Amino acid sequence: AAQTNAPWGLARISSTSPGTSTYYYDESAGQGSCVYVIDTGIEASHPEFEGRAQMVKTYYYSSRDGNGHGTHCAGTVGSRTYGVAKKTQLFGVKVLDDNGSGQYSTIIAGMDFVASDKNNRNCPKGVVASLSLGGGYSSSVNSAAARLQSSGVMVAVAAGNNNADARNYSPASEPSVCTVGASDRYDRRSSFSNYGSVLDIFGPGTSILSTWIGGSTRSISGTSMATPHVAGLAAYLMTLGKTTAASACRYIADTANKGDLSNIPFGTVNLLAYNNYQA
Ligand SMILES: [Ca+2]
């Protein structure tokens, strides 16, 4: 399959070189997989989700996305136009309020929720979680992310936007999950992206067009935007039978475009997510 005039990030994930604008992918498109988006929620009624999105949990007085951030992330995972895995099922877990804030205890509860709730969903090709959130180091937050991964969910988490070493942030610093840095259209590390030995992979994170609340669309930037590219890629690869939740991060790193990014600090991986699709 080929989507012409795709967002640059989708084109990049299917390309050995920057500067192209068509997204190429196997038509299976993540069918039979599920991705949980743990964030501010998802506007499920957005035409771009085609009935494939559902709120499953909230810790606040509403499950609606009153922010936009979660809807944007969900769109990059699996909207028809802006998504990597255009046939995946999307499940929203609102651990962040409409200001994008959340107490660590609520975030941890949301991760443990997904670890159980996947047993209530039909996801024969496998389960992914995209966590576009972060705060300072907390062993408890890291441990929750490790449990979620351990339960059989491919966990992708944002490295953070501090232009700092991700070892000081959680869940970014958790070794057993997939920590994702952000890059730009010109294959440079995004200026805000955290870095460090704890990073596993880079994905497109600067100027990312995707869905927003009120049925609209928006371009925004963050390691929160790179993460769902990787989450979506994982879902896509799992439906293709190429990998499993346990080894998808490893598989993505093994099959990445290597040594192509600039401004990568010494000791940080130079690996950009790539679907290796031969059209
Ligand atoms: Ca690891």
Side-chain angles (χ1 to χ4, degrees), residues 1-63 65-277 279:
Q3 177 191 355
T4 54
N5 296 297
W8 79 262
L10 298 196
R12 190 67 189 90
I13 284 231
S14 61
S15 185
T16 50
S17 77
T20 68
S21 63
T22 305
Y23 176 38
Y24 308 104
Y25 59 96
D26 188 279
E27 14 277 298
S28 60
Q31 193 137 254
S33 66
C34 301
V35 185
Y36 288 80
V37 177
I38 307 178
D39 209 298
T40 63
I42 311 175
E43 186 172 280
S45 65
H46 195 128
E48 276 284 316
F49 297 121
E50 305 184 301
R52 290 175 290 104
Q54 248 190 194
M55 283 307 297
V56 298
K57 182 63 177 178
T58 178
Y59 296 86
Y60 305 90
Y61 329 73
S62 182
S63 67
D65 185 8
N67 180 282
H69 167 73
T71 294
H72 198 275
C73 290
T76 294
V77 176
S79 67
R80 193 206 76 205
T81 305
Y82 311 100
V84 176
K86 294 173 187 308
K87 277 69 166 304
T88 197
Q89 287 294 130
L90 297 163
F91 298 126
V93 181
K94 181 171 177 55
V95 300
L96 302 183
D97 67 13
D98 287 344
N99 297 135
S101 305
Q103 326 96 101
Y104 265 166
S105 182
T106 299
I107 294 168
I108 287 157
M111 286 192 258
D112 282 324
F113 173 84
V114 178
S116 188
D117 185 73
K118 72 161 161 50
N119 297 129
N120 287 327
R121 304 302 162 194
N122 237 65
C123 312
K125 301 296 184 183
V127 178
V128 187
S130 182
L131 278 164
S132 291
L133 41 64
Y137 183 88
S138 164
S139 57
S140 293
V141 173
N142 278 12
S143 177
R147 287 192 299 275
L148 180 59
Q149 179 68 47
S150 170
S151 82
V153 174
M154 188 286 183
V155 180
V157 310
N161 301 333
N162 314 276
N163 187 209
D165 199 306
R167 63 157 43 118
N168 286 137
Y169 296 94
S170 288
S173 59
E174 169 53 42
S176 70
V177 305
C178 211
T179 302
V180 182
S183 61
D184 76 14
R185 189 194 292 268
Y186 300 105
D187 279 355
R188 304 176 298 216
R189 182 175 55 98
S190 300
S191 61
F192 52 79
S193 186
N194 287 169
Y195 49 86
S197 66
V198 77
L199 265 73
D200 301 284
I201 190 70
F202 283 84
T206 297
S207 293
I208 302 302
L209 177 64
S210 183
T211 40
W212 199 255
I213 51 174
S216 55
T217 59
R218 211 98 159 172
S219 182
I220 64 169
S221 304
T223 52
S224 198
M225 278 68 260
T227 301
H229 288 264
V230 175
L233 179 59
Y236 169 85
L237 293 170
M238 293 161 63
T239 52
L240 285 180
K242 300 275 191 185
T243 190
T244 66
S247 51
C249 189
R250 215 155 167 176
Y251 180 88
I252 291 171
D254 288 352
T255 57
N257 286 127
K258 316 194 172 62
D260 296 328
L261 294 173
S262 69
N263 200 24
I264 297 297
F266 195 82
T268 292
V269 290
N270 194 144
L271 300 164
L272 182 64
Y274 174 51
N275 79 179
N276 283 261
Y277 181 62

